[PDB]
Amino acid sequence: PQLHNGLDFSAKVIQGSLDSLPQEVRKFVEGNAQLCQPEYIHICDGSEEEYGRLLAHMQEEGVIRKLKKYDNCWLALTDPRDVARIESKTVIITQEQRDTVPIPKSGQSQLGRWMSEEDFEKAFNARFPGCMKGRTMYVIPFSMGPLGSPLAKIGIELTDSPYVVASMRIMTRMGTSVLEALGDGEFIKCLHSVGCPLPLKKPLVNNWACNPELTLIAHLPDRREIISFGSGYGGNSLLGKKCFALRIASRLAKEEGWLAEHMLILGITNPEGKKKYLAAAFPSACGKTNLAMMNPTLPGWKVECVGDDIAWMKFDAQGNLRAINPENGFFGVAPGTSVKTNPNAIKTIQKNTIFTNVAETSDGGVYWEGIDEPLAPGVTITSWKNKEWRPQDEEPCAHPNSRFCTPASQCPIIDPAWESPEGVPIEGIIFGGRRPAGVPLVYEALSWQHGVFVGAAMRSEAGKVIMHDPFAMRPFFGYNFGKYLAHWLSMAHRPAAKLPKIFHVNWFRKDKNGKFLWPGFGENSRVLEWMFGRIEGEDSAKLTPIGYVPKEDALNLKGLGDVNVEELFGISKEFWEKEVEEIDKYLEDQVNADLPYEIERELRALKQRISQM
Ligand SMILES: [Mn+2]
Ligand SMILES: [Mn+2]
Ligand code: NA
Numbered sequence: 001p002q003l004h005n006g007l008d009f010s011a012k013v014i015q016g017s018l019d020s021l022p023q024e025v026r027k028f029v030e031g032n033a034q035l036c037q038p039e040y041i042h043i044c045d046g047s048e049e050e051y052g053r054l055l056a057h058m059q060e061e062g063v064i065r066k067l068k069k070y071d072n073c074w075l076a077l078t079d080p081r082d083v084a085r086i087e088s089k090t091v092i093i094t095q096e097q098r099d100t101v102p103i104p105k106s107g108q109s110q111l112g113r114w115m116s117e118e119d120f121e122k123a124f125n126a127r128f129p130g131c132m133k134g135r136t137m138y139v140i141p142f143s144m145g146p147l148g149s150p151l152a153k154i155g156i157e158l159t160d161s162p163y164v165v166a167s168m169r170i171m172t173r174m175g176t177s178v179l180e181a182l183g184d185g186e187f188i189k190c191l192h193s194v195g196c197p198l199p200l201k202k203p204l205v206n207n208w209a210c211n212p213e214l215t216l217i218a219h220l221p222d223r224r225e226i227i228s229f230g231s232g233y234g235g236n237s238l239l240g241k242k243c244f245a246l247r248i249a250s251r252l253a254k255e256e257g258w259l260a261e262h263m264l265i266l267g268i269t270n271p272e273g274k275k276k277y278l279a280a281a282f283p284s285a286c287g288k289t290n291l292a293m294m295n296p297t298l299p300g301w302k303v304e305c306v307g308d309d310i311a312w313m314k315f316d317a318q319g320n321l322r323a324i325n326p327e328n329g330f331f332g333v334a335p336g337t338s339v340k341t342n343p344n345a346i347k348t349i350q351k352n353t354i355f356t357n358v359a360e361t362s363d364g365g366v367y368w369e370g371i372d373e374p375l376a377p378g379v380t381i382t383s384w385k386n387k388e389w390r391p392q393d394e395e396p397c398a399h400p401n402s403r404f405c406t407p408a409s410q411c412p413i414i415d416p417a418w419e420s421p422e423g424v425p426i427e428g429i430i431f432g433g434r435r436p437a438g439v440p441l442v443y444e445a446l447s448w449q450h451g452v453f454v455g456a457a458m459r460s461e462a463g464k465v466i467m468h469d470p471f472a473m474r475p476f477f478g479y480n481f482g483k484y485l486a487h488w489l490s491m492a493h494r495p496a497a498k499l500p501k502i503f504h505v506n507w508f509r510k511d512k513n514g515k516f517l518w519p520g521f522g523e524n525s526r527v528l529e530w531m532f533g534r535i536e537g538e539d540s541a542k543l544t545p546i547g548y549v550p551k552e553d554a555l556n557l558k559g560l561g562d563v564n565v566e567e568l569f570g571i572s573k574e575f576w577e578k579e580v581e582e583i584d585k586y587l588e589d590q591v592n593a594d595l596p597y598e599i600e601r602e603l604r605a606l607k608q609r610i611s612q613m
Contacts, residue, residue: 009033009041014136015050016043022184025156029139032158032191037130038137044165046141046175051166058162062207064354068364071351075360076163077384078233082210083357084401085235085242087475090217091115092247094479102482102594111474111481111590120218127195127214127229134198135160140190141179142172144240144249144312144326149421151258151312151324153249154182155226157190157239161209164192164237167354170329170405172240188224188248190239195230206386208232219243221251221478234331234356234403242476245310245326250478254487257494258314262472264292265307265323265424267415268528271300276532279311279323279500280430281472283460287507287520289332293344293413296525298556303525304415305344306424307408308332313426319496322423327408334358334402338372341521344413345404353406357384359397368398427535428501431471433460434508438575441518441568442527444503444534444541444548451502452488453602454547457583461508468586482594489598501535504547509568517568519560526556544571545609576610 002008009030010018018026021043033041044050055074058064067073091113092100100114115123138159145152157168168174195211196202202211215230226243228236235242249260263279282288292308307325316322330348334355337345349355359367362380375381381397383389389397408414417424431454433439445451455471468474470481477484491497505527507520530550533540541548549569557563584603587595 007034012039012041014040014042015045016139021179022182024184025141025179025182025187028156028189029137029158033137035128036132036137036160036193037197038132038160039134040136041139042136043139044141044175046169046177051169054162054166058166063163065360066364067355067360067366069361070353070365073351073353073355075355075358075366077206077208077386078357079205079208079210079212080385081205081212082208082215082231082233083399084233085475086215086217086231087113089215090475091120092219092221092478093117093120094222098594099480101477102480102591105589105592107589109590110468112477115218120220123216123218124227127216128191128193131193131195131197131229132160138162138165140165140168140174141176141182142168142174142240143178143181144172144244145324146419146421147173147177147181149324149423151314151322151423152326152421153188153244153252154178154185155188155190155240155244157192159192159237161192161194161232161237163232167238167405168240170352170354170407171238171327171331173328186224188226188244190226190228190244192228192237192239193230194232217243219247219478221248224248238331240327241331246473246476247478249312249326250473250476250484253312254479254483258312259488260478261311261313262309262476263311263429264288264309265305265311265325265426266292266294267304267306267417267424268532269302269304270529270532276427276535277306277323277424278428278430278528278531279313279426280432281455282432283434283458283469283472285336286432286434286460289330289345290342290521291524293342293411294524295343295522296528297522297559298525298529301525301529303528304413305411306415306418314423315491315494315497317496319498320425321498321500323426324423325408325418329408330404330406330411332404332406334366334404335368335396335398335400336370337368337404338370340372341370344411348411349404349406351410353404355402355404357399357402358404359383359389368402369396426500428503428531430503430505430531431455431458432505432507433458433469434463435459435466435506436461436508436510436514438572438579439504439506439509440546440549440571441507441509442503442505442530442549443544443546444501444531446547448492448499448502449489449598450547450602450605452485453599453606454502454504455488456485456587456599459582468590480594482591482596485591485599486596489596501531503531511564511567517564523560529556530554545576545606545613546571571613573610573613580607580610
């Protein structure tokens with residue numbers, strides 16, 4: 001109803017129908033149309049035609065370029081002000097701050113950023129009214145997880161960015177079938193705007209609409225809403241990627257008895273024809289995507305990829321920890337990707353892939369630091385800043401946070417169960433970090449409780465600073481980290497739960513000259529072999545103050561040699577005394593009153609074991 005003509009947006013719909021939408025979806029779309037004032041509303045169908053025509057359109061407006069060397073590949077170059085997630089502008093809204101972050105004992109919380117409901121309403125009002133003027137509001141119905149999976153969750157993202165629509169088609173399952181499946185069910189409300197209403201009030205840089213000054217990425221778990229303004233980039237704009245997949249989902253998981261985690265999922269098969277699934281949480285630049293798509297050097301071993309970033313996991317009625325990859329593609333950091341580091345990634349990204357902030361070669365190909373392959377004489381490079389570039393220039397040819405966005409179905413080693421609705425049974429959980437000193441190649445937690453402590457104690461070289469990144473979730477906690485620790489610990493008391501073995505890895509231990517003690521890459525399959533045996537109950541471990549390590553001769557080093565196993569697995573009293581002190585100080589300050597008894601107990605236990613060496 002209306003007394004005039006400004007509430008019903010039916011006449012502005014250029015694809016689909018408001019009438020055909022479920023009631024709450026229409027209310028969401030129409031209410032935000034009233035607010036944002038788009039010129040048109042396009043209800044996405046997810047069809048190849050829609051996708052193809054939108055890409056062609058972006059190409060005409062100078063927003064993307066076709067990469068002619070490859071099959072249906074594209075390149076976007078951004079405003080240099082808009083190149084990454086911005087933590088300081090990423091907030092969670094709850095009635096009480098304590099529900100979002102623990103109240104630290106002495107310092108500022110680094111476990112999240114809380115914003116009051118009142119501060120957010122003011123921020124919202126100063127950003128969204130009229131923000132889509134002159135632009136199309138695209139309505140993206142998407143599923144996080146295989147369609148109809150008991151573990152899947154549905155979202156609807158509204159955006160004024162065609163770049164976002166195209167990337168969301170790759171990264172999620174989107175389109176009409178999602179709407180039809182949703183019906184009158186619940187969904188996560190996702191609202192995004194680049195914040196550049198037309199006519200433009202500020203200069204457009206590199207044909208990339210953004211509003212750096214007003215950039216704000218907000219999460220409202222109680223309202224089931226994600227609201228993001230001012231950035232068109234990655235984790236800020238593709239609202240499934242981190243906002244939904246980790247922040248909202250972890251809070252939903254807390255409520256519902258499951259886990260939403262920053263973990264790859266892989267399937268590994270041994271020479272005896274046995275297959276196991278493992279999950280792994282690593283901080284940035286620790287070889288996460290490399291492990292997920294690893295090409296094992298050990299004969300008769302196979303690794304297959306379920307996911308490279310996010311895992312949604314739930315203990316079923318039988319006690320198995322069943323995990324799905326809630327994503328539909330890989331949004332990988334481009335620099336450092338080579339045939340040596342990730343041959344399978346190379347194979348994936350040469351078709352139907354969108355690249356962002358990488359360099360472009362004169363023959364329409366892609367280039368970045370660490371690509372590790374020469375260009376034929378003649379082939380020149382345009383940097384990510386649209387300038388001529390030479391391999392002896394001062395600045396990198398690709399932004400360090402540049403990306404490929406590629407369909408998961410294209411990975412040559414994608415797991416056959418990667419979209420099974422039931423999920424895959426997780427038998428091991430691997431934590432990791434880049435530690436040049438002190439931390440052995442691999443160890444195994446003494447118990448579930450010790451394992452949760454190991455996750456909580458995670459640290460990694462940011463290098464000349466060792467920073468904390470518990471569970472690799474520091475930028476992504478949807479709620480109080482103390483309560484998250486409690487939630488994890490509670491899994492041990494769940495009837496019939498089969499708790500996976502927990503391991504910690506360090507590929508990056510160096511000698512006193514600064515050279516890596518472990519060859520890494522495909523040789524990491526040797527570490528995975530040891531884990532596989534341990535899960536099977538193999539008597540291949542030796543007790544140390546930090547947990548179990550491989551026995552002498554347990555680790556398969558055939559084909560290697562001579563590897564300094566003594567240094568690689570060396571455990572120093574002095575190092576670990578300091579290590580446990582830093583963990584203690586961190587947990588006391590950052591978790592404080594919300595630190596569970598059992599985590600404090602594990603800290604005490606580790607202290608004691610170190611004291612006795
Ligand atoms: Mn990630
Ligand atoms: Mn307990
Ligand atoms: Na551009």
